[PDB]
Amino acid sequence: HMSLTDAVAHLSPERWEEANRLLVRKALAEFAHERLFTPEPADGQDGRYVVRSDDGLTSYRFTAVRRALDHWQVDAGSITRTRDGAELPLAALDFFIELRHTLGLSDEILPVYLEEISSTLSGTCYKLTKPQVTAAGLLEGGFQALESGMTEGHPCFVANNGRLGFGVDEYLAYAPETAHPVRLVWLAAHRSRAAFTAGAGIDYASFVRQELGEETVERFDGVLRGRGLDPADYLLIPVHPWQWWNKLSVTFAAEVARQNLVCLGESDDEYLAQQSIRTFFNATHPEKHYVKTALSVLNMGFMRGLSAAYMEATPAINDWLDRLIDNDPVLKSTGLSIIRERAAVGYRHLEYEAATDRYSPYRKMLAALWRESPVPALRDGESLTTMAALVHVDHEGRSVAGELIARSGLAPTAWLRHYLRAYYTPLLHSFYAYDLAFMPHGENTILVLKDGVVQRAVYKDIAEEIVVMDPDAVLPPEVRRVRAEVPEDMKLLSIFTDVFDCFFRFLAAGLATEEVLAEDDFWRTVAEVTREYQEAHPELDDRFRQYDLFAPEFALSCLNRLQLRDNRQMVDLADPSAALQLVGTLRNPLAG
């Protein structure tokens, strides 16, 4: 009963009530932003709104402050729910069922979507169990206290933390917000099925020696020899323990039995799950590589396995981009860097390949890559934070961005100006000069701080995410795969959607509500940095006109709509712009 009751102790009536209030608040706000419903001003009161269930008989009433880019800052405490003239408790599950038709939830998707909602609420309950920490307290804790202290997740997606596949015990062991140390499972994979791809400067033997140590390498060698096997025929693959215990040991039982796969045991180092869940920071040795693992759990619109076939191209692309950054003085002056995916390993399951198509999750169950740590490059007085921290608000209403602005002693617009030159200017130059787009959200960006000021930004998650939006661009063989055909009037969405509407809308609204920086000042600083860039590069004036960042309007691209339409595979990934749902337009805050 003790471990049994402890595992569910975070699930209490009061925490569940709070979690539901918060999640329904987010659902009202973001589903309004995407025009799934239009909140109508309420019968008495001004600034109070009502949204009704599908059949009209249930009313959700609330107050909200409206801000730029159609942002609805819904007040959590103001939300009421009424049916038949009686107040009802707030329950996100009932919410989605009552609105199943308005929100476009098919009968096939709704039950699974409700599981993701339930897990997101359970995660909020666990996070409410943790010690309260201020923004300053997080900064004092450091890089991983910030990483595991984030509570919101992706700011747009309501059903963003499902992690479907975790039992509650596995949730407690593996969720990044629990910050429990994890030991990776190491497998020996026969070279008839497994391939190791080394980035520029990497050598397999020395790479493995540096990552594991001579003693552990010798122990693994001895396991293989104890089985009568030649270690030279095998490669090392680290795996998430969930994947081993629940998928590889069962789904790949034939590979284990025939000794195509050999379980070597656990790593000596202790690892911490990052916000992506499936990527691990090495806590014992922060200078060692991240390990990104295949995890066949559902989270935020995709199964989180990792494609064995694509590992073959991954290090080279990083090398290519790394050279591009290094040879461009505009990018060099911004201090931009990437933490490269340096090495990758993939296992090709021949029978499942014969049994499936190219995009199956069965081809994504066993692969791993290693990513450079950002810690070694730190200079004196510098510290690291995930960019998501900028829009994390603590129990007192203080955000990390606000705490940093205060601690720095600079004017808010000046602090913002440094942040924008580190993070946003490189995106402008990549787009205009190279047709290059990232996916630069809060989880894919790390900020280097000194004296409370953003010194420079580090990008990650590269080979899977970058796009060169020119099908006929001249590119080296191993990089030519990132080219894509994106319609002309959608290319600048890489800035409009991914930067403005999916991150800056939240940061500007937060800093305004926090009474640190007014909306007009935020967006004026953004416009100033944009023109500061463009006026410095008249050789691109034509492209500046072709892709006008100062147009009066741009398309509203809805993110939740993607997940509500297809829970398991939000976008094709072979044609990712085909699933986008642009619903009208937003007024560009840069129009002035």
Added chain:
Amino acid sequence: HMSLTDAVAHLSPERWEEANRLLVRKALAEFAHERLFTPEPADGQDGRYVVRSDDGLTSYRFTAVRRALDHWQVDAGSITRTRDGAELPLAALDFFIELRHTLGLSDEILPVYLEEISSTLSGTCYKLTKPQVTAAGLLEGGFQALESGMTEGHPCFVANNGRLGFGVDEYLAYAPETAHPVRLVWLAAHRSRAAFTAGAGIDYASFVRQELGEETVERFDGVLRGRGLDPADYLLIPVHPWQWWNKLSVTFAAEVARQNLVCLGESDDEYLAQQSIRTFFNATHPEKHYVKTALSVLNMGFMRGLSAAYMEATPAINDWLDRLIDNDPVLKSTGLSIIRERAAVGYRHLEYEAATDRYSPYRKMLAALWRESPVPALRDGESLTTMAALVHVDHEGRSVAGELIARSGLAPTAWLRHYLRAYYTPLLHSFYAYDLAFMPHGENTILVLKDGVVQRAVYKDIAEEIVVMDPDAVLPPEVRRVRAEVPEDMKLLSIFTDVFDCFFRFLAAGLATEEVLAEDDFWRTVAEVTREYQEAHPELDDRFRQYDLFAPEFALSCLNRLQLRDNRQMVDLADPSAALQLVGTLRNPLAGL
């Protein structure tokens, strides 16, 4: 490394080779029986045949003895696989991929089906790790040594032991063939959502006191009071641990958090999973009830959850059948009994009900029932065995049926006659006198043995399985749902398929290959017992002519074809006859005899 490497130690190259040979043997045999392919005689040798892949380029060659009911006794040692003029190793996964179109495996189902094959093979490797035990050794061990010592599973279905949802550690903890003790998880379920239904003579308070004991009852009471709750508002529901840790604490987290469900902790008694996986025998107190739990894993064509809505009528239906058995002298003279489903509890998840349709697995995640133990009724010198043991063959080639025949000192036909009067005669009478059909396979039947002789049969798995094949039958209200509309020329399949073609085919073939009893003698004995029943009841002659058990032929109803067509829900269950795949006819072994 220690627990990691131990958990997969049963997965070795030699055990995997043996498992793949055995499973491909079964696939050739049963897919031939169901006419998915027709083995072509290989020129030159009398009993050698060849089966080819979809593209014709891979050949599986084997010897087989052909037996009644189109039974193919494929010899495991003879199987070879050749492609492009080269011999290849035997691999069940490759077999199904090579034959995906011949077998009707869609692109959606094939990968999941391969997972079921892989887990079946892994279970065989584990079973190969266990101490070798003879048929006599199993009989010496007793009821649960036999229950967990069964190795085949269902004799028709090739992908019969998937248990999809178990990780390898959960396999080791929960699979019936590992026989590791299990402690059930007890939940308190609020009476606004959970309902307890008792059979006649059952009382909730005394029922729980007898099953748990006053100490545990009060401990659970104190858990509820410690949270400020009134125990009178709650009911107890036992749950499979896998179900709690993987489904109820996550999928029903809203119910746990709001205290509609309260985790009370583990039971004191230790339980053993039975062949059905989700039903548990109480090892600490064998006289106490079985607990059948909801288990949302896929096995042999169905998710194994338990419907909350059906619980309310389950005890009453059992009571009804019990009285029927009790008032009929023909059934009484056979010694037939059922172990009743005596109590049941169901949890109605209102949000998931609103979000799904009546067939959803989401409505089958939280329910339980309690089934009488057969141990108390045992008399002096009597022992118990699953009927599945009769077709279990040990490492020396002796079946448990052969061991019992030898130990009894009876001639094989005389032994068989006692077994048939206990097991088969009640099925004849249920059909002809009541339009009643069971699902009487090896796992749903327990045999009572004395002096190596079958004294009587115990039927289980009742309310969800019985069918009254008469839509206008006069029945008490709470029982009327067991009525069904079955096409006329399919009603007698309840004997032809479920008894003859799905169990006696294997028993007869096995006792013949074992050189205990010739096929003709087996089937002649079955014919004799059939006439022994029918001649004793001339008032039913019309029905005997209407449903002729001596007809020259009857339909071949294919079992694997169902699972190959629909991995997750082999049959509708609102209309179970519509999914059946009849492919030609079989020669009735009783036609001559």
